[PDB]
Amino acid sequence: HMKTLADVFREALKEKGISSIGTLSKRFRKSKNKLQDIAIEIVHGKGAVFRVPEKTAVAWDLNGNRVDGSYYAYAPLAMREKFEPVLTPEELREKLPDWPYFIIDLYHWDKHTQKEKGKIALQVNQSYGLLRDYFTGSELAVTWANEEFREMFHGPLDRITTYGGPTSEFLKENGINEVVLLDPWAEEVLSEKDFDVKAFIIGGIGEELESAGIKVRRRKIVDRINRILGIILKMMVEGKSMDE
Numbered sequence: 001h002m003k004t005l006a007d008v009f010r011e012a013l014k015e016k017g018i019s020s021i022g023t024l025s026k027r028f029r030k031s032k033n034k035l036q037d038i039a040i041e042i043v044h045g046k047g048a049v050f051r052v053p054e055k056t057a058v059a060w061d062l063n064g065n066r067v068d069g070s071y072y073a074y075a076p077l078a079m080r081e082k083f084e085p086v087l088t089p090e091e092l093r094e095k096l097p098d099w100p101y102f103i104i105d106l107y108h109w110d111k112h113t114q115k116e117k118g119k120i121a122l123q124v125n126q127s128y129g130l131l132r133d134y135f136t137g138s139e140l141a142v143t144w145a146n147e148e149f150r151e152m153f154h155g156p157l158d159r160i161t162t163y164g165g166p167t168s169e170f171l172k173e174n175g176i177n178e179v180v181l182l183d184p185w186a187e188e189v190l191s192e193k194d195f196d197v198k199a200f201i202i203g204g205i206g207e208e209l210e211s212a213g214i215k216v217r218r219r220k221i222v223d224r225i226n227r228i229l230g231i232i233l234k235m236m237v238e239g240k241s242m243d244e
Helices: 005-015 034-043 089-093 114-134 147-152 167-173 206-211 225-236
Strands: 020-023 047-051 059-061 072-076 084-087 101-105 140-143 161-163 178-182 199-203 215-219
Touching (some): 005 084, 020 034, 034 047, 034 089, 101 114, 101 167, 101 225, 114 147, 114 199, 114 225, 140 167, 178 206, 199 225, 206 215
Parallel strands (some): 020 072, 101 140, 101 199, 178 199, 178 215
Antiparallel strands (some): 047 072
């Protein structure tokens, strides 16, 4: 039921009458979802879709299938002054739906060993990788972000949401008064009825939030932060039951 970035990008292209798109930067070789990867570059301001004077050597239709070349192609903004812009970073941003935040809370960080800190940092990087395959990647939010985590984290800090303060203040800054807290000892299993909530806390407390005025839905999954997230995204986006 929930749209992906590629769905939003496809519908934006279809709305403008564009049936296939090529690329001028060779940075998309070995790509599972071409439209998702193109949309990611655009939504982060790296380039746009342009009309080009000559047909590309190859293109992909709106289903991602390789077709003959197109008169429309992605290019970086470093090649902007030449061609007609057709789908800009600004146009695509305005069509994004209000996707939920996925929060990794880093209070308790200084309580882990150095090996466990490394495992956490890797899992947060893998969680960003998942979210940039479905949404923009900016839905990943790390609260209580410290410099040690930033040194250990090897992903793009400019694309994930990082917050120096507590989870409750991050939520209040963003007008979120109700969250799902992934808890393995919760009595209620996560279900489709929980997918209207605007934030999911997937890593890292519940009492802390509730004393701060946040409604907390304790929900369990039937482990690694990125595994948890991947299960949630398959439920929300692909409509799959938890058995997947």
